[model samples]
Structure formats: structure tokens, C-alpha cells
Target: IPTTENLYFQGSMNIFEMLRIDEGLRLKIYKDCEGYYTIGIGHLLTKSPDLNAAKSELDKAIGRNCNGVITKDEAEKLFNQDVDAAVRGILRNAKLKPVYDSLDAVRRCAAINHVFQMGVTGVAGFTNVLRMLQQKRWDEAAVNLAKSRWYNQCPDRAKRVITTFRTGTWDAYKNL
Candidate 1:
């Protein structure tokens, strides 16, 4: 160990680094309209459209500490989107009241179920992509193998209705 008293030699090192920062903004569309959308830095292991849960999570994301090293504006610029897609999708696809009523619990459960499916399917790969091969089962495959995490963020009623139309029961994929 060298002490300040010795002070015989002093050395400093400088290094250059570069990285491409990719940020994703997820809109958690819960109960159709009333919810928050979180801004994820770098990447998230999760996705959203379940607007209800997105509220608290967005609050957490916005209120987090950047250790004074990064400013809120910078972070916002890095990750921010209008999030109207969720609203539009919900309005277009989901049934209103039933989904709204059970928005909290059902949406969370559905998201977990989807996460499991994604894990099993290897995420965003060929399994997750749309396969138009088996024409008879095309619709079913599309719904079952969606890659976006936000696909099922809507409440159970909407989800179930979509499932019924696109595939089968809401729990069908889960059971299988």
C-alpha cells in the first residue's frame, strides 16, 4: 500500500466506451381507459397493456431515483410513447363492463399465464412469430403465439371474448 505521504508517483487512466441504448415504453391498458403506462429503461423482462397494474408501476418508474446522475427529461426522452395503442386495442377488441369489473385480479393472472407461455415458446423467436402454414389453424396460432408482451393486457372479459373468437376458452392455452 502506498500512502499520501510517499507521493512519489501518481497515475491516472482514461477509457472510451460506446453503447446503443434502446428503450421501450409499455402501455398497460387496464379496464380500457383508466390506467398508467410505464417507461422501461434498456429492456424489461415484462410487457403490459393491463392498464390497471400499469398505474402503480408507472408511478414507481417515474418516481424512481436516478442518483442525480441522469435527469428525468433525459429518461423521458429515452422512453416515452403516447400509449394510445392500448386504448384503441381495448376499445376495438374487449367487452367493456365485465373486463372493467374484474380488471385487477384477472389481468394480472392473464399476464402471468402469458409469461409462462412465452417462456415455454422461447420468446420472440419462430415459436412466438406468426405461422401461416396450417391455414385451418392460422387464426388460432396467431393468437397463441403473439410475441408482444402487451397482447393480453386487457381484462378477462375482453381476453376471453377474443380467445373464444380467435382460439377457444381463456384458460385453454393455460391448461395446455
Candidate 2:
């Protein structure tokens, strides 16, 4: 798990890898804990363009269940697309950009994971966490993230992301 300055495909891959624990792989779509239709590594298949379009393309053949299913490769593609969107969202925000640039690639993935879980606006709501990250206060940032609702909900992902921020390393998380 090496870090990367390039947050395009590589960043997406890291985000995808780390997400296996939280998102899990499901070729068939299923409703998540919050009741959103999900598919392919936690892609909340909601809108027409993403979920509907993918679904429409899926059952062009006969005898398909049409209950929402996709191949592993297709799942990977959606994952990359979703992570890229979050990556772009992070790099485009003034509140996030500078702090994002100031951190190493591992820390960047951790932050992106947060954005993936709760949109960029959601993570932005963490005022002290953002401030701590901007100041390079890794310990404070990790502690603040630990205090989040997401932590209680999915501490596995949160702790890994928190450790990534604190140590700027992905090895420990990779093992999990």
C-alpha cells in the first residue's frame, strides 16, 4: 500500500481496497442499513443515471432475474467512477483543497474515505477536524474523527482511516 500524489485511478483503487471491510462486494443489489439501494461495493444505486442506467443495461438478455445484478468487473468500474467523483469533490473544495494538499497520500485516502461515507459537505461539517488536519495535527484529527457518528456506526472503517491519518501508513489497514 504505497501512497500516491496522483489521486486518479490509484487513489480510487486504494479507496476501493480499504472499503472492502465496510462496503463488501455484492454483485446483486441490496438495501443497505440506511435503506438505500446499493450495489458493487456500496454504490448507493439511487438516481436514474447511475442505478437505473446500469440496471437497464444489465438485463438485455433473457431469463435474467432483473432484481439488480452485475458482474465483478462492472462493480469495479462503478467503484472507480464513484471514488473519482469524491476525489474531484475533495480537490475542488477550498475548505478541503489546501488541507488535502498538505497531507501525504495515505492521509489523503483517509480523508477521501470520509468524503465517500458522508459527502464532502458532511466531512466539512467537522470544523475542528478540518482545522486539525490543516494544522498537521494528526493526533487531534484522528481523535476528532473517532468522535464522529460514522465511527460508532462503522468503527472498522473509521479506525483504519483514523490510523491512516495518524501514522500516514496503509500497511496496518491493508492487513485488515
Candidate 3:
């Protein structure tokens, strides 16, 4: 039952692992590298007013003050919600939809990972990289991605993502 072939099942669990590795569990709200208020495993708390509503609900559930902390359980819930949003966001993109559907489950996770790290518009900006991926030119896609500022922003995570995209599997993260 725990197979990586099913994106909603084990595949998503692997994606969660990748996200947790990239964004360590944070019980309190903190600013991410780009200076947006983030919390609970890279969940953006100030993405917009509607996003604030999500944060407010979580805060109320835990009776949290602005400076208060969240439980690990709360963090996991936030992670799930954010990851789900990222999943749907990728599917909603017309250009990305077909390419994403064609990928194996592992590479599907890679795309979601990309969007989750940088947001859908950020991924959209990787125009050529997306084409390279759609054409199944794995190396070209990775190399194109390497030239981006995102790579310089977080080389470690970027390296992992590139390797995953290139190889089209979770193997790149197996030992990492």
C-alpha cells in the first residue's frame, strides 16, 4: 500500500519528507529567506489577507498569541494544508497541467516541490526549464534550472531538486 506510484499516497509522503528536509519544522512564526512571515514547515502566514485567515484559524485553534508557539500537531496540519494547496496550484496551470500529468509520480513530486519552494508564478518564470521538462529533456531542464537565482538562493535544496528532476525518481533523496 505504501508505493511511490500513487501521488496521493506514498508519493505525497515522500514529497512531505522533501519539504520537511528543506523547511525544518518550526513551531513559531519566523521570516523566511525572502523575509515573508513563515511558520510550521514553511507555511506562508502573510501571503495575503485570505492566507491570513488560514493562519488566524490555526492560531485560534491553539489559542496562540502573535508571539506564542504551536504544537507539532499543529505544524503537521499546516504542512498538509499547504502541500495540498501546492498540488492543486500546479494542476490549475494550463501550461503546466499536461506536462505535470505526463510525469511519473516521483517527478510529479519534484514539480510540486518546485512550486512549494518558490510559488507557482516563480515556477512559471522558469519558462524554458518547463519546456525542457515537458519535452522530457531531463538534463537540459536541470541545467537550465541551475542557471536560475533560485539555485543560488538555496544550492543544497536546489541540487536535490535538480537531481530528482534529472533522474525522475526519489533516488536522489534516498541517502540525503
Candidate 4:
């Protein structure tokens, strides 16, 4: 059977593409459509968009600390940095690392997405799901992932992950 491992960058590329689609590339500072301060691939600001701290962070990305907006290059660079951090964060967990490493590239992306959506600690809280993944029970893991509130929140994304676990590739589009 074909596997994601055969592809270059495999799981990581899946993440990058999905994030790009989901977040959309923003070259300038603006509030997210959902009404929060966002820039560079759907990154949400911690506070209100009007806050000085938010503006300051956006300014820092472009080199100064003012209202100046970020460039496309800066947005891409920041997105890359954020994705790198998310990948590393998923792999940094002592308990999750072994299970994550044991997964194939496709499933590894699932774990990474879970961590991406809900931090490592939040993902870890899915005790049964983690146990199923740890035991390499792909079917059960898929079912478990579908049963979670996370799935309820984003059925499409959850189905993408569940399908990956069962088939070692996401749906035809291969997105999360």
C-alpha cells in the first residue's frame, strides 16, 4: 500500500497546507474574520486587537514597534516559525513522543494536529485516545477521536484525522 512516508516532508507538508488553507495568508495586520487580531496564517492575538501589546508584537515581526503592517515575506516567515514550534511541541512530550514516533507519517500528523489545535497538555487529556494510539489500535483511535468534543467542534478536521488513522492518508484532498 502507498504511504505518506513516500512523499517528501510527508506529515509536515500536510500540516502546512492545511494551516494555509484554514488560516489563509495575511500579509497585513487585521482582525480575523471571527473578530480577533490576527496576522500571518490565522495566528490569533492573545488579547484584543486594539491592545498596544498586540500591535507591538506585529510591529516586532516587521522590525519596529509601531502600527506598521507585516509584509508577505514576514508573514510567511512567521508562519514557518509557528509551524516549526507546533511540530516540535507535539514531539517534545515525554509520554506522547514515543507514541507519536511510533506512528506513521500520516498518523503523526494527526497527533501533531491535535497538539496544534489543543496544546500538548490539552491533547494529553484525551487519555483513552492516547492509550489507543500508544497501543497502535488505529480503528479504535479513530473512533475515540470522533467521539471527542474536539470532533464536535470541527467535524471536517476530525474526520480528516480519523481517516488518516484508518487509511494512513487523509481523505482524497489529504488535508486536516
Candidate 5:
């Protein structure tokens, strides 16, 4: 029953989030497209043979009580076993883990700020270039914006910056 459309291969980029044991049960976030219903929002164990088999097993166990196949107690027992098995399997396979206890908030924030600074620098440069371009200062615009490298990078941003530059912002590029 595993067709190309219905069958998801193991190691396909279909993870949602994972609970890491080594790292104190931290969650690893994943963005998925085709496996929403199958993956849901639970911690994913990567040891599944494939997505279909894993989802099918979990779905059946969940439906056992709702569909009147298994009683509430039976469903609970099955669910516990399934969850424990999945968690154990995941811990056995994964090497690097993200967990709450091992998280360094200050370090993470610093890394995030580093990326933000790149955005700041790029935007400021582009803004300076756009101002000159609005005033028909082609050479200055080209130099500031790195237009020779990227033709249509951040078009709307450049436009907005240029608009501001034209409206009495006489020295937009003078300071920066």
C-alpha cells in the first residue's frame, strides 16, 4: 500500500519536533508540508521504518478507544507502551540533542543578534544606495547598494528608503 504519494521514506525531511534525552528533553523543531496529519505536533522518533507505518500504528492505537474497539484502559496501556518505545528508540539513535536543561539562553541570544546585525548592515547599505538613486545619482547608488552583485535584491525596501531620502532627508547616506 506504500505508493509514491502515500509512502514517505525514512529520513525524508518530514520531522516535526523531537525530544532529546541527552539534552534534558528539549524539543527540536521541524517544518513539514505533506505529513501534517501523519506527524501531528508530537515528538517524532526517527527510528520508524517509514512515515506511513509509524503513523498507521499510532492512529490505530488512538482510534482503538474512540471506535469502540478497545476500552479506555486498554487504549491507555497501548499508548503508554507506544510512547515509551518511540522515546527509547529516538534516544538510542540521535547523537546531538536539544534539551531544556542544556540550553544556554545568553549564548543563543548572542547568536541571534549576530544574524540580526547582518540584516542591519545590509539594510543600511541598501537604504543609502536607494537615496542616491532617487536623486538620480546613479554612480553613488550603485556603489552603496552593491547593485553589481544583486540586481533585484530587496526592491520594495530600496524603494521605501529612497522615498524617505527624497522627502527632506538631505543627508541619509552622509552619516552612515
Candidate 6:
């Protein structure tokens, strides 16, 4: 019963939680473990050229001193920007269109999360899983996903995604 708009918000919230996007300003810009200059949660300071250009503009607006900091408002804005892009990307991706259109909110969130983490091309690499999902073959899709490197990389997340896809339900993390 999830509408497109509800799915969008749920998917965005899911990304926010998974990415641990803090509202606090990280005053000092620093590199990630992968040596990417990241600031204000996982926002890359030097990935895309366009992002760099925008970073330059933001730096100018906020003053690029050692003491410069991103406000909570700015961080939320950045999170929303990235989340919106991910939503739009998943929806527009022709490869995922059938699966995206056929699934409910939870399953759609799983698909969006996969695409968000791995990119559309990477998700497309899961040929068997994609095929099964597109065919509305939930059980086979879950099994295929369970056998992927992505499952090995993050078993818990993969299990959650598979469970949601197979059962069409999610137990809310009440503690959070």
C-alpha cells in the first residue's frame, strides 16, 4: 500500500540511518578510511567534479578556514540532496524498472539501498537475483542474494533485505 512518495521518504530514512549522517557539524574536514576527503557524515569532498565545484561554492559561502564548520541545517540539506538523487536514480534506472514497479515499499527500499551502496551498474551485476526479482520470484531472489559477495560483505543487512523481500514485512527497530 506504499505510495511512491512514502517509499521515497522511507528509503531516504533508511539511507540516513545506514549512513549515520550526524546532524553535528564536523568542523575539520578529514579523509575517510578510503582516503576520500569527507565532511558532514559521508559527503565526499572530492569524488565528482560537479560535487567538487559545489564544494568550492559552499566553501566560499561558509569561509574555508580551519575553524569552518557545516551547520546541522546544511548537513540535513546535503543528506536530503543525496537521498533524493538515489530515489530518482532507482526509479529512472531501466534495468530496475520492473522490479521497482512491482515491489512494495519495504522491498523497494531494499532495492534502492542496494543500488545506493553498489550503484546501478553494480546492482545490475547481480544477474540472477535481478532476474528472479523481475519475475516476482521472491524466494529465488532471496536465495540468490544470500549467495552473493554482497551478503558476505554485510550478512546482517543482506538478511534484512532478503527477509523483507520474501516476507513483505519489517519489524521496527523499537530501540531506535
Cα lDDT of model 6 by residue, 57-112, tens digit: 45854565323358766666765676666678877878777778887766787776
lDDT, candidate 1, at 171: 37
Candidate 2 backbone collisions, by pair: none
Residue-level lDDT of model 4, residues 35-120, one tens digit each, is 56777776655456475667877776657654746777777877787777778887777878888888887678667666665667
Which residue pairs of candidate 1 clash? Answer: 28-49, 28-51, 29-49, 29-51, 30-51
**lDDT tens readout by residue for model 2, 1-176:** 43464334344446668776667889886766655667777787664445665465445321354658778887787778778888999999989888889887777888888788788898888899889988889898888888898786756546777787888866555434
Candidate 3 lDDT, 1-176, residue by residue in tens: 53555434344458889888777888876667756667788877665435455467557645665444688887898789788989999889987788799888888988988888888889987889888888899999989889888887768757788888999766665544
Best model number under lDDT: 3
TM-score, cand. 5 vs. native:
0.21
Q: For each candidate in the order shown, give its overall lDDT on alpha carbons.
A: 0.32, 0.74, 0.78, 0.69, 0.32, 0.62
Q: Which scores higher on lDDT, 4 or 5?
A: 4
Comparing 1 and 4 on lDDT, the stronger one: 4
TM per prediction: 0.22, 0.77, 0.79, 0.72, 0.21, 0.61
- Ranking 2 against 3 by TM-score, winner: 3
Best by TM-score: 3
For candidate 6, give the lDDT of residue 46.
65
Clashes of 1: 5
Model 6 off-target regions past 4 Å?
Answer: 1-69, 156-159, 172-176
Which residue pairs show backbone clashes in model 5? 26-99
Taking every candidate in turn, the Cα RMSD to the unseen true structure, in Å, is 19.7, 6.3, 5.4, 4.2, 21.2, 6.7
